Design a binder for this molecule. Structure first.
Ligand code: A1H0N
Length: 118
């Protein structure tokens, strides 16, 4: 059975290397596909800086900090929040980055997270 939270180490990708720049065409689809790729180990993370989001496809899936009181074992506790046309679906803390499919790109780092399964 799946636990409420899972430890994952996500590959951090540079935006210009990403081949598949989003998970789908609707808020519900991108959240669904992101969660599936997270379970399969085929999800990467792009850190948000100026210029990044316009190079990626909407809707966006962000991982955001869900608890600022403790980060177990160095894994920041995080949850998913989607965004389309300036409207967010969920409310959470600070953005760690935007999730994208990982299809073999070489990462620049790994980001340890404790992901809320839902
Ligand atoms: C199964 C593999 N060909 C693949 C499917 C969808 C996405 Br998104 C990335 C890779």
């Amino acid at each position: 059975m799946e636990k409420t939270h899972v430890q994952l180490s996500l590959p951090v990708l540079q935006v210009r290397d990403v081949l598949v720049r989003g998970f789908g065409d609707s808020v519900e689809e991108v959240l669904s596909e992101a969660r599936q790729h997270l379970k399969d180990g085929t999800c990467g993370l792009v850190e948000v800086e100026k210029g990044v989001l316009p190079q990626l496809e909407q809707p966006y899936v962000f991982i955001k900090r869900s608890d600022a009181r403790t980060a177990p074992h160095g894994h920041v506790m995080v949850e998913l929040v989607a965004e389309l046309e300036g409207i967010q679906y969920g409310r959470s803390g600070e953005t760690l980055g935007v999730l994208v499919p990982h299809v073999g790109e070489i990462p620049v780092a790994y980001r340890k997270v404790l992901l809320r399964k839902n």
